CSV table of all heavy atoms in Angstrom, one decimal:
chain,number,residue,atom,x,y,z
A,1,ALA,N,-2.0,-2.8,-1.5
A,1,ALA,CA,-2.3,-2.5,-0.1
A,1,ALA,C,-3.8,-2.6,0.1
A,1,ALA,O,-4.6,-2.6,-0.9
A,1,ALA,CB,-1.9,-1.1,0.2
A,2,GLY,N,-4.2,-2.5,1.4
A,2,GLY,CA,-5.6,-2.7,1.7
A,2,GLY,C,-6.0,-1.9,2.9
A,2,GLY,O,-5.2,-1.3,3.6
A,3,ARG,N,-7.3,-1.9,3.2
A,3,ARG,CA,-7.8,-1.1,4.3
A,3,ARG,C,-7.1,-1.6,5.6
A,3,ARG,O,-7.0,-2.8,5.7
A,3,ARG,CB,-9.3,-1.3,4.4
A,3,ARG,CG,-10.2,-0.7,3.3
A,3,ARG,CD,-11.5,-1.2,3.7
A,3,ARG,NE,-12.4,-1.3,2.5
A,3,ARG,CZ,-13.2,-2.3,2.3
A,3,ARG,NH1,-13.4,-3.3,3.2
A,3,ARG,NH2,-13.9,-2.2,1.2
A,4,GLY,N,-6.6,-0.8,6.5
A,4,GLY,CA,-5.9,-1.3,7.6
A,4,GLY,C,-4.4,-1.0,7.4
A,4,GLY,O,-3.7,-0.9,8.4
A,5,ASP,N,-4.0,-1.0,6.2
A,5,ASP,CA,-2.6,-0.7,6.0
A,5,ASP,C,-2.1,0.7,6.2
A,5,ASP,O,-0.9,1.0,6.3
A,5,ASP,CB,-2.2,-1.2,4.6
A,5,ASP,CG,-2.1,-2.7,4.4
A,5,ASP,OD1,-1.8,-3.4,5.4
A,5,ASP,OD2,-2.3,-3.2,3.3
A,6,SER,N,-3.1,1.7,6.1
A,6,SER,CA,-2.9,3.1,6.3
A,6,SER,C,-2.0,3.4,7.5
A,6,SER,O,-2.0,2.7,8.5
A,6,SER,CB,-4.2,3.8,6.5
A,6,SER,OG,-4.9,3.8,5.3
A,7,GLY,N,-1.1,4.4,7.5
A,7,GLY,CA,-0.2,4.7,8.5
A,7,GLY,C,1.1,3.9,8.3
A,7,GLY,O,2.2,4.4,8.8
A,8,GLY,N,1.1,2.7,7.7
A,8,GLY,CA,2.2,1.8,7.5
A,8,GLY,C,3.4,2.4,6.8
A,8,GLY,O,3.3,3.3,5.9
A,9,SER,N,4.6,1.8,7.0
A,9,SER,CA,5.8,2.3,6.4
A,9,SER,C,6.0,2.0,5.0
A,9,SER,O,5.6,1.0,4.5
A,9,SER,CB,7.0,1.5,7.1
A,9,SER,OG,6.6,0.9,8.3
A,10,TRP,N,6.6,2.9,4.2
A,10,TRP,CA,7.1,2.6,2.9
A,10,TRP,C,8.6,2.8,3.0
A,10,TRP,O,9.1,3.8,3.6
A,10,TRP,CB,6.5,3.6,1.9
A,10,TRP,CG,5.1,3.3,1.4
A,10,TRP,CD1,4.0,3.4,2.3
A,10,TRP,CD2,4.7,2.9,0.2
A,10,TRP,NE1,2.9,3.1,1.6
A,10,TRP,CE2,3.3,2.8,0.3
A,10,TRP,CE3,5.3,2.6,-1.0
A,10,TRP,CZ2,2.5,2.4,-0.8
A,10,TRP,CZ3,4.5,2.2,-2.1
A,10,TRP,CH2,3.2,2.1,-2.0
A,11,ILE,N,9.4,1.9,2.5
A,11,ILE,CA,10.8,1.8,2.7
A,11,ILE,C,11.5,1.1,1.6
A,11,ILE,O,10.8,0.2,1.0
A,11,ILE,CB,11.1,1.1,4.1
A,11,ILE,CG1,12.6,1.1,4.4
A,11,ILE,CG2,10.6,-0.3,4.1
A,11,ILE,CD1,12.9,0.9,5.9
A,12,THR,N,12.7,1.5,1.1
A,12,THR,CA,13.3,0.8,0.1
A,12,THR,C,14.0,-0.4,0.7
A,12,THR,O,14.2,-0.4,2.0
A,12,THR,CB,14.4,1.7,-0.6
A,12,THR,OG1,15.2,2.2,0.5
A,12,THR,CG2,13.8,2.9,-1.3
A,13,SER,N,14.4,-1.4,0.0
A,13,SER,CA,15.1,-2.6,0.5
A,13,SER,C,16.4,-2.3,1.2
A,13,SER,O,16.9,-3.0,2.1
A,13,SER,CB,15.3,-3.6,-0.6
A,13,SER,OG,16.1,-3.1,-1.6
A,14,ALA,N,17.0,-1.2,0.8
A,14,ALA,CA,18.2,-0.7,1.3
A,14,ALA,C,18.0,0.1,2.6
A,14,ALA,O,18.9,0.7,3.1
A,14,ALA,CB,18.9,0.3,0.4
A,15,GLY,N,16.8,0.1,3.2
A,15,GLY,CA,16.6,0.8,4.5
A,15,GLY,C,16.3,2.2,4.4
A,15,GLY,O,16.2,2.8,5.5
A,16,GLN,N,16.0,2.9,3.3
A,16,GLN,CA,15.6,4.3,3.3
A,16,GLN,C,14.1,4.5,3.4
A,16,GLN,O,13.3,4.1,2.5
A,16,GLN,CB,16.1,5.1,2.1
A,16,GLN,CG,17.6,4.9,1.9
A,16,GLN,CD,18.5,5.5,3.0
A,16,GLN,OE1,18.2,6.5,3.5
A,16,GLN,NE2,19.6,4.9,3.4
A,17,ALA,N,13.7,5.0,4.5
A,17,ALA,CA,12.3,5.4,4.8
A,17,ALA,C,11.8,6.5,3.9
A,17,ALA,O,12.3,7.6,3.8
A,17,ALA,CB,12.3,5.8,6.3
A,18,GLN,N,10.7,6.1,3.2
A,18,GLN,CA,10.0,7.0,2.2
A,18,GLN,C,8.8,7.8,2.7
A,18,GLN,O,8.5,8.9,2.3
A,18,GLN,CB,9.6,6.1,1.0
A,18,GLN,CG,10.8,5.4,0.3
A,18,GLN,CD,11.8,6.4,-0.1
A,18,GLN,OE1,11.6,7.2,-1.0
A,18,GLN,NE2,13.1,6.2,0.4
A,19,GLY,N,7.9,7.1,3.5
A,19,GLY,CA,6.8,7.8,3.9
A,19,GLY,C,5.8,6.8,4.6
A,19,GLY,O,6.3,5.7,4.9
A,20,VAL,N,4.6,7.3,4.8
A,20,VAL,CA,3.5,6.5,5.5
A,20,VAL,C,2.3,6.4,4.6
A,20,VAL,O,2.0,7.3,3.8
A,20,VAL,CB,3.1,7.1,6.8
A,20,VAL,CG1,4.3,7.2,7.7
A,20,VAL,CG2,2.6,8.5,6.6
A,21,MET,N,1.7,5.2,4.5
A,21,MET,CA,0.6,4.8,3.7
A,21,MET,C,-0.6,5.7,4.0
A,21,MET,O,-1.2,5.9,5.1
A,21,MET,CB,0.2,3.4,4.0
A,21,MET,CG,-1.0,2.8,3.2
A,21,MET,SD,-0.5,2.2,1.7
A,21,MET,CE,-1.8,2.6,0.6
A,22,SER,N,-1.2,6.3,2.9
A,22,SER,CA,-2.3,7.1,2.9
A,22,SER,C,-3.5,6.4,2.4
A,22,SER,O,-4.5,6.3,3.1
A,22,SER,CB,-2.1,8.4,2.0
A,22,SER,OG,-3.2,9.3,2.2
A,23,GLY,N,-3.5,5.9,1.1
A,23,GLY,CA,-4.7,5.3,0.5
A,23,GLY,C,-4.5,4.5,-0.7
A,23,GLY,O,-3.4,4.6,-1.3
A,24,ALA,N,-5.4,3.7,-1.2
A,24,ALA,CA,-5.2,2.9,-2.4
A,24,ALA,C,-6.5,2.8,-3.1
A,24,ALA,O,-7.6,3.0,-2.5
A,24,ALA,CB,-4.7,1.5,-2.1
A,25,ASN,N,-6.5,2.5,-4.4
A,25,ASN,CA,-7.8,2.2,-5.1
A,25,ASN,C,-8.2,0.8,-4.8
A,25,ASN,O,-8.0,-0.2,-5.6
A,25,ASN,CB,-7.6,2.4,-6.6
A,25,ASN,CG,-6.5,1.6,-7.2
A,25,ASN,OD1,-5.4,1.3,-6.7
A,25,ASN,ND2,-6.6,1.3,-8.5
A,26,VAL,N,-8.7,0.6,-3.6
A,26,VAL,CA,-9.1,-0.7,-3.1
A,26,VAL,C,-10.4,-1.2,-3.9
A,26,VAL,O,-11.2,-0.4,-4.4
A,26,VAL,CB,-9.4,-0.8,-1.6
A,26,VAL,CG1,-8.0,-0.4,-0.9
A,26,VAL,CG2,-10.4,0.3,-1.1
A,27,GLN,N,-10.5,-2.5,-4.1
A,27,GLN,CA,-11.6,-3.2,-4.8
A,27,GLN,C,-12.5,-3.7,-3.7
A,27,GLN,O,-12.3,-3.5,-2.5
A,27,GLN,CB,-11.0,-4.3,-5.6
A,27,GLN,CG,-9.8,-3.8,-6.5
A,27,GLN,CD,-10.3,-2.8,-7.5
A,27,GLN,OE1,-11.0,-3.2,-8.4
A,27,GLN,NE2,-9.9,-1.5,-7.5
A,28,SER,N,-13.6,-4.4,-4.1
A,28,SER,CA,-14.6,-5.0,-3.2
A,28,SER,C,-14.0,-5.9,-2.1
A,28,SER,O,-14.7,-6.1,-1.1
A,28,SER,CB,-15.7,-5.7,-3.9
A,28,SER,OG,-15.2,-6.5,-4.9
A,29,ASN,N,-12.8,-6.4,-2.3
A,29,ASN,CA,-12.2,-7.3,-1.4
A,29,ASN,C,-11.4,-6.5,-0.3
A,29,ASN,O,-10.8,-7.1,0.6
A,29,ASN,CB,-11.3,-8.3,-2.1
A,29,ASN,CG,-10.1,-7.6,-2.8
A,29,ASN,OD1,-10.0,-6.4,-3.0
A,29,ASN,ND2,-9.1,-8.5,-3.0
A,30,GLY,N,-11.3,-5.2,-0.5
A,30,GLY,CA,-10.6,-4.4,0.6
A,30,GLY,C,-9.2,-4.0,0.2
A,30,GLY,O,-8.6,-3.3,1.0
A,31,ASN,N,-8.6,-4.5,-0.9
A,31,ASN,CA,-7.3,-4.2,-1.3
A,31,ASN,C,-7.2,-4.1,-2.8
A,31,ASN,O,-8.2,-4.2,-3.5
A,31,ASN,CB,-6.3,-5.4,-0.7
A,31,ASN,CG,-6.5,-6.8,-1.3
A,31,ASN,OD1,-6.3,-7.0,-2.5
A,31,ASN,ND2,-6.9,-7.8,-0.5
A,32,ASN,N,-6.1,-3.8,-3.4
A,32,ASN,CA,-5.9,-3.7,-4.8
A,32,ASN,C,-4.8,-4.8,-5.1
A,32,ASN,O,-4.1,-4.6,-6.2
A,32,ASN,CB,-5.5,-2.3,-5.2
A,32,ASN,CG,-4.2,-1.8,-4.6
A,32,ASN,OD1,-3.4,-2.5,-3.9
A,32,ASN,ND2,-3.9,-0.5,-4.7
A,33,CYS,N,-4.6,-5.8,-4.4
A,33,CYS,CA,-3.7,-6.9,-4.6
A,33,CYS,C,-4.2,-7.8,-5.7
A,33,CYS,O,-3.4,-8.3,-6.5
A,33,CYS,CB,-3.4,-7.7,-3.4
A,33,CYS,SG,-2.6,-6.7,-2.0
A,34,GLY,N,-5.5,-7.9,-6.0
A,34,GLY,CA,-6.0,-8.7,-7.0
A,34,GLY,C,-6.1,-8.1,-8.4
A,34,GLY,O,-6.6,-8.6,-9.3
A,35,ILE,N,-5.6,-6.9,-8.6
A,35,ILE,CA,-5.6,-6.3,-9.9
A,35,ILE,C,-4.2,-6.1,-10.3
A,35,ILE,O,-3.3,-6.1,-9.5
A,35,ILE,CB,-6.4,-4.9,-9.9
A,35,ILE,CG1,-5.7,-4.0,-9.0
A,35,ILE,CG2,-7.8,-5.2,-9.6
A,35,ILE,CD1,-6.3,-2.5,-9.1
A,36,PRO,N,-3.8,-6.0,-11.6
A,36,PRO,CA,-2.4,-6.0,-12.1
A,36,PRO,C,-1.7,-4.8,-11.6
A,36,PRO,O,-2.4,-3.7,-11.5
A,36,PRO,CB,-2.5,-6.0,-13.6
A,36,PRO,CG,-3.9,-6.5,-13.9
A,36,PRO,CD,-4.8,-6.0,-12.8
A,37,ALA,N,-0.4,-4.8,-11.4
A,37,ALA,CA,0.3,-3.6,-10.9
A,37,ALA,C,0.1,-2.4,-11.7
A,37,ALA,O,0.0,-1.3,-11.2
A,37,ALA,CB,1.8,-3.9,-10.9
């Protein structure tokens, strides 16, 4: 996730709503998509 994603939905593929995005250990590019899971 990245800056701007906050508030966004978390949901399982089966349709169960889990919560809303709070924060992530974002890197200099604004997201943590470039580091391993």
Side-chain angles (χ1 to χ4, degrees):
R3 293 177 204 138
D5 285 331
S6 288
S9 344
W10 279 69
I11 181 161
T12 54
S13 60
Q16 305 298 320
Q18 303 301 299
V20 300
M21 181 87 217
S22 187
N25 55 330
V26 297
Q27 308 295 295
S28 47
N29 71 337
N31 63 65
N32 58 9
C33 294
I35 56 167

